[PDB]
Write a protein that binds this DNA or RNA. Structure first.
Ligand SMILES: [Zn+2]
Ligand SMILES: [Zn+2]
Length: 637
RNA sequence: UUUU
């Protein structure tokens, strides 16, 4: 490394554009950003940063700070006690106190004055928030881990920084991308980006549809290049497109075996959401009497290593790679990953899963980038006939099936992952509720409610409409008194036994595990009940099996004896709520993406589909395309 | 409050 050698030049230009009265105590690197500590308060920053080509954060010296047990009631006083301040956390690792007030306007300073007045008394960065409608165990837990681990996090960030700046901006000699999983297949997405100077992992999923076979369930750990990057400790960073297990599922496995301790970049909502899905994942395994892939301490490590980034925020993550995340419109926090390699040498955009039309919760994926030579895109519906049903026709079909089900005295089972389709279908029923249509109750089972809480904590990540409809008003469609969160194992049993028709939405989305499987098993026989698939059912899942028509499904239970569930209930498939761009959308994304890429690489789709989309794009746009296999490596330059 |  030669970082402090570089800081020696940074410090020579910083202490050259700011009054010595600022008594600059220290200037170090914290993750991507540069930290300039000073022992005194107070347009300059904007200039300092535009010159240094970095993200600078200037805070008071960590010495002029007050303990969280003394600076708590010291602030609670210097604030108009009207704005109900539900909570008030502490972040000493970055000097910044969080004021989770119910009324932010009366706590920040009616005239932007109670902003600096308050900070003084304790010398902590005053940041106001609006007590979200729902409380999240997950968010609270993360906050707990971050504040009670300030020591490590500080150590970790300083290291990452010395790493990211082990040398000045570099122009790479070559660039290659290798598929470790998720190429010509759905699941276990994992793409390794290489240059002669760096290595970054884009996603690292698992395929729950096949944990039975680790060679089909995990990314290729058996790739020479990947083993070489892990063992030598050369992985600069891991980036996650979105929270689903098939993109971040194996991430904690990495810590369980001490294979990595570098930074993980992702949007805040994805950090919170993935942590949720991971705990949910190991617990479902255990409830099944199976040894879990990892444990809470491992997930605790993920948290401790994650460096969040909001959309549009450009950050240097290595000497020759610059990251920027953009909206993918797939699920809360979903991002298209953009890599600016070299200083104008080459640019890659990895799509992850994306939707290119509006939905209740999100806006179509970003299709504009400053530069874009190579585009890696998903192909879940890459087939030529993979046109999803129009959103409104689906919506109407969903209400239809429910009526023809409630009428004949039955229940409607809607399997869906805690994150994604669940909230989308919720909205559909919630708007339909406000106009008199939701008679029977709607039960949410499987951490779907916990996930819904996280949504309400991130209004800025939802569509502008749903966003304003959140904080600006005292309204919230998620709070709707029409959803009844299934509290425990018992309540679940009651619901099943009861005779009151009802709508049941529960994870997992593919009947691969969790609350959804119990309902399935118990409702299958009765033809009064109905099951509606509103998500892609992957090959190898009990879901696709049921969705395919199989009427007698063998299932292995305890003490090794198999069970044969008799499927009589009605089987319906409504794909119009999909979080995936359909065939038309994918093609249309290519047409609109700008700048037009030199080459497109189709991935994340059944083999035929990746092939089909790739062949189709080339034929219609004349763009160089390819549908690589895992372990294929494409030299981009 | 960095860039091609
Ligand atoms: Zn997904
Ligand atoms: Zn996926």
């Amino acid at each position: 490394t030669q970082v402090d050698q570089i800081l020696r030049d940074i410090r020579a230009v910083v202490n050259q554009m700011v009054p010595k009265e600022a008594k600059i105590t220290e200037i170090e690197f914290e993750g991507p950003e540069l930290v300039i500590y000073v022992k005194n308060p107070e347009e300059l920053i904007k200039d300092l940063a535009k010159v240094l080509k970095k993200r600078i954060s200037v805070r008071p010296d960590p010495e002029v700070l007050l303990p969280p047990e003394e600076a708590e009631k010291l602030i609670f006083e210097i604030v108009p006690k009207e704005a109900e301040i539900t909570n008030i956390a502490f972040d000493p690792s970055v000097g910044e106190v969080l004021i989770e007030a119910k009324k932010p306007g009366l706590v920040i300073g009616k005239n932007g004055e109670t902003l600096r007045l308050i900070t003084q008394k304790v010398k902590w960065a005053p940041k106001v928030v609006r007590t979200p409608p729902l409380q999240s165990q997950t968010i609270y837990s993360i906050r707990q881990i971050l504040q009670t681990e300030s020591k490590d996090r500080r150590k970790f960030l300083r290291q990452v920084g010395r790493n990211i700046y082990r040398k000045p901006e570099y122009k790479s000699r070559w660039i290659r991308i290798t598929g470790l999983g998720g190429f010509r297949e759905v699941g276990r997405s994992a793409l390794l980006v290489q240059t002669d100077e760096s290595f970054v992992l884009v996603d690292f999923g698992v395929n729950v549809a096949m944990l039975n076979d680790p060679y089909k369930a995990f990314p290729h750990f058996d790739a020479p290049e990947f083993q070489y990057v892990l063992r030598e400790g050369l992985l600069d960073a891991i980036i996650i497109t979105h929270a689903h297990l098939d993109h971040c599922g194996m991430l904690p496995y990495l810590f369980r075996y001490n294979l990595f301790d570098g930074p993980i970049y992702t949007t805040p909502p994805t950090r919170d959401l993935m942590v949720l899905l991971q705990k949910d994942f190991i617990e479902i395994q255990q409830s099944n009497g199976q040894d879990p892939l990892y444990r809470p301490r491992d997930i605790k490590e993920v948290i401790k290593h994650t460096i969040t980034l909001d959309y549009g925020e450009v950050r240097d993550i290595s000497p020759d790679i610059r990251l920027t995340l953009h909206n993918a419109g797939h699920i809360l926090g979903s991002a298209i990953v953009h890599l600016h390699i070299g200083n104008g040498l080459h640019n890659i955009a990895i799509t992850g899963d994306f939707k290119f039309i509006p939905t209740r919760l999100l806006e179509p994926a970003n299709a504009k980038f400053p530069r874009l030579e190579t585009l890696v895109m998903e192909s879940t519906y890459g087939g030529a006939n993979d046109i999803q049903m129009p959103r409104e026709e689906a919506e109407k079909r969903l209400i239809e099936v429910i009526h023809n089900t409630i009428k004949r005295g039955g229940k409607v089972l809607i399997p869906a992952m805690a994150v994604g389709r669940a909230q989308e279908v919720m909205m559909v029923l919630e708007e339909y509720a406000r106009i008199g249509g939701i008679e029977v109750p709607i039960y949410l089972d499987g951490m779907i409610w916990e996930a819904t809480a996280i949504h309400t904590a991130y209004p800025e990540y939802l569509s502008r409409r749903l966003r304003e409809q959140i904080f600006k008003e005292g309204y919230n469609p998620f709070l709707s008194e029409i959803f009844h969160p299934v509290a425990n194992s018992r309540e679940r049993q009651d619901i099943i036994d009861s005779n009151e028709p009802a709508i049941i939405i529960a994870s997992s989305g593919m009947l691969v595990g969790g609350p959804s499987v119990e309902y399935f098993k118990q409702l299958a026989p009765d033809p009064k009940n109905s099951i509606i698939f509103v998500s892609y059912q992957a090959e190898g899942t009990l879901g696709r099996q049921v969705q395919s028509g199989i009427r007698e499904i063998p299932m292995v239970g305890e003490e090794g004896r198999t069970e044969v569930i008799k499927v009589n209930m009605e089987v319906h498939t409504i794909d119009g709520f999909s979080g995936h761009a359909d065939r038309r959308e994918l093609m249309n994304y290519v047409a609109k993406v700008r700048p037009r890429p030199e080459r497109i690489i189709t991935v994340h789709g059944e083999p035929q589909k990746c092939l089909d989309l790739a062949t189709s794009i080339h034929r219609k746009f004349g763009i160089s395309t390819r549908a690589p296999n895992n372990l294929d490596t494409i030299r981009l330059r």
